[PDB]
Amino acid sequence: VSLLDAVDRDSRKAETSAPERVRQISFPMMYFKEVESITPDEIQGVRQPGTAN
Amino acid sequence: YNGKFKDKRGKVHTLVSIDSVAATVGVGHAFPNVSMLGEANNIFEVAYGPCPK
């Protein structure tokens, strides 16, 4: 909206306001993935750090 | 003892033999008999281990 301007009474002129604006948008999204595996060679004869045998 | 076996390549392996000795020369191996000692038999043993599974 904006201010309003005075007009002569007898001229009978006026003002008007412009219409509204509508718009649309969109978004992509991020994908994350990772992998891990366990094999017997990790437990064959491997001592635990905090113990003896 | 006349035992003999064949390899995948067809090579014949005689159980009673001495390496680098002609077959025509008599050959034999001597050892003591300990089988009757049973659980106290500490002279001959066979070890066995786990598989990678």
Method by which the model was determined: cryo-EM
Q: What is the resolution of this structure in A?
A: 3.4
Query: Token match 């993935």: residue?
Result: A33
CB B29 within 8 A of CB B16: yes
B20 in Cβ contact with B31 (< 8 Å): no
C-alpha distances in Å from residue B7, one per residue of B10, B19, B21: 5, 17, 20
Sole residue written with tokens 């004869």? A45
Q: How many CB pairs under 8 A join A and B?
A: 5
Picking from B34, B14, B35, B36, the residue whose alpha carbon sits closest to that of residue B25 is B14
Q: Which residue of B has its CA nearest to A43?
A: B52
The CA distance from B52 to B48, in Å, is 13
Structure tokens at A1: 């909206």
Q: Distance (Å) from the C-alpha of residue A27 to the closest C-alpha of chain B?
A: 48
